[PDB]
């Protein structure tokens with residue numbers, strides 16, 4: 001049975017408790033915490049690619065008001081479908097299962113300017129999603145998982161000072 005487990009879930013939950021925020025910039029910013037998963041139940045002999053995208057969570061944006069996140073207006077039109085291919089792709093099932101798979105190099109941006117970055121809209125909430133795509137498959141089988149503990153609001157600058165301090169504490 002294929003299982004994709006979130007690593008450092010307790011750490012992600014510390015951020016989610018406060019409402020997590022990830023900075024987006026013109027040139028792109030890596031995430032903290034880094035999305036990392038453990039994988040079991042692939043065919044060790046088969047080859048697969050791992051991909052990452054970000055799903056919009058709401059039909060509205062958010063705003064930080066009097067120290068609380070609240071519905072903050074109408075949403076902007078959806079960000080373009082950006083997909084990040086894990087740089088180890090394609091690789092054997094045995095490779096992906098021998099140690100956690102880490103998406104440490106992905107960068108989030110608010111400006112489409114190449115570099116394999118992910119475009120997000122500031123003040124909107126997103127949920128990371130990991131896809132496993134089997135290589136050489138005429139049926140193009142793909143298996144997707146979402147990670148609820150990793151939801152975050154994209155921001156140009158941190159709003160909650162507790163988030164600013166958590167990012168410094170754990171990173």
Ligand SMILES: CC(=O)Nc1ccc([C@@H](O)c2ccccc2F)cc1
Pocket residue numbers: 051053083131133139140141142
């Ligand atoms: C059966 C079927 O729809 N297969 C399929 C679909 C999409 C892809 C990727 O292009 C892909 C595109 C966007 C996001 C993640 C992805 F993995 C690969 C295989």
